[PDB]
Each structure stands twice: as structure tokens, then as C-alpha cells.
From Swiss-Prot:
Residues of the full protein shown: 24 to 113 of 113
Name of the protein this chain belongs to: Non-specific lipid-transfer protein
Task of the protein: Plant non-specific lipid-transfer proteins transfer phospholipids as well as galactolipids across membranes. May play a role in wax or cutin deposition in the cell walls of expanding epidermal cells and certain secretory tissues.
Keywords, in A-Z order: Disulfide bond, Lipid-binding, Lipoprotein, Signal, Transport
Keyword Transport: yes
Amino acid sequence: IDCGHVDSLVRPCLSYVQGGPGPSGQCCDGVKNLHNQARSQSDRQSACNCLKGIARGIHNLNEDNARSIPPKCGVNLPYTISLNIDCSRV
Ligand SMILES: CCCCCCCCCCCCCC(=O)OC[C@@H](O)COP(=O)(O)OCC[N+](C)(C)C
Ligand SMILES: CCCCCCCCCCCCCC(=O)OC[C@@H](O)COP(=O)(O)OCC[N+](C)(C)C
């Protein structure tokens, strides 16, 4: 999957991952859309690598807030996410 596209889907989550109120509906929709598009193993792994690279470039990233996005947005994942998630097993 294209990192530019991934970036566009989650861009609305920025304010929240930086400590602001949220997650907004636009953030959740982007995440749901990404979840709906990254289906094959390659795409999940690709999307994972992308998000980890994007997250590492955010100043004052709040990992606690970023981690709670899936559960707060209603997207159930069989695991917890973090900056050190192994993308080869997602
Ligand atoms: C399905 C699982 C979902 C996982 C949740 C993902 C959480 C992370 C989402 C973050 C999205 C926001 C990223 C972004 O779009 O960047 C916004 C930028 O303004 C951040 O700054 P940079 O890209 O580093 O730009 C450089 C800024 N400078 C020039 C001031 C240093
Ligand atoms: C929090 C700090 C920021 C770092 C950002 C890293 C987060 C990376 C998140 C990657 C998410 C991968 C994309 C995705 O949406 O996939 C979700 C799946 O892994 C979960 O769906 P399931 O079908 O339950 O997957 C289980 C495997 N199956 C398909 C064989 C059943």
C-alpha cells in the first residue's frame, strides 16, 4: 500500500496524538477505512511500516493517546499497538 495514501487517511488524528481532545470522527473514519483496505498480509505489513514511519516523525507524539485510537474508535484488533510493534506479524 502507498504511504502517501495511508498518511491521508490518518492525517485527521494528528491533533489527538499530540495530546489534544479526541479522537475525532474524521480520525476514526480514516482508521476504519485503512482497516477496510489493508487486507492482505502484504498490505497490513506495508501499512504497518508506513504508520510506524509516520509516527516517528511526529513531534511530541503521545503514544498513550495513539495506542487508544483503535479501541476508542471501535476498531477491534487482536493485539495492542505501540511504536515497537513487529510489522511482520500484523
Ligand atoms: C489501524 C491502526 C491505527 C494506528 C493509529 C495511527 C496513529 C498516528 C497517526 C498520525 C497522523 C498524523 C501525521 C501527519 O500527517 O503528520 C502531521 C505533521 O504536521 C507532522 O509533522 P512532520 O510530518 O514531521 O512535518 C515536519 C514538521 N516540521 C517542519 C515542523 C519539523
Ligand atoms: C502507537 C504508536 C504509533 C505506531 C503505529 C503503529 C501501528 C501499526 C498498526 C498496523 C495495523 C495493520 C493494519 C490492519 O488494519 O490490520 C488489522 C489486522 O491486523 C487485524 O484484523 P484480523 O483479520 O483480525 O487479523 C488477524 C489475521 N487474520 C487475517 C489471518 C485473521
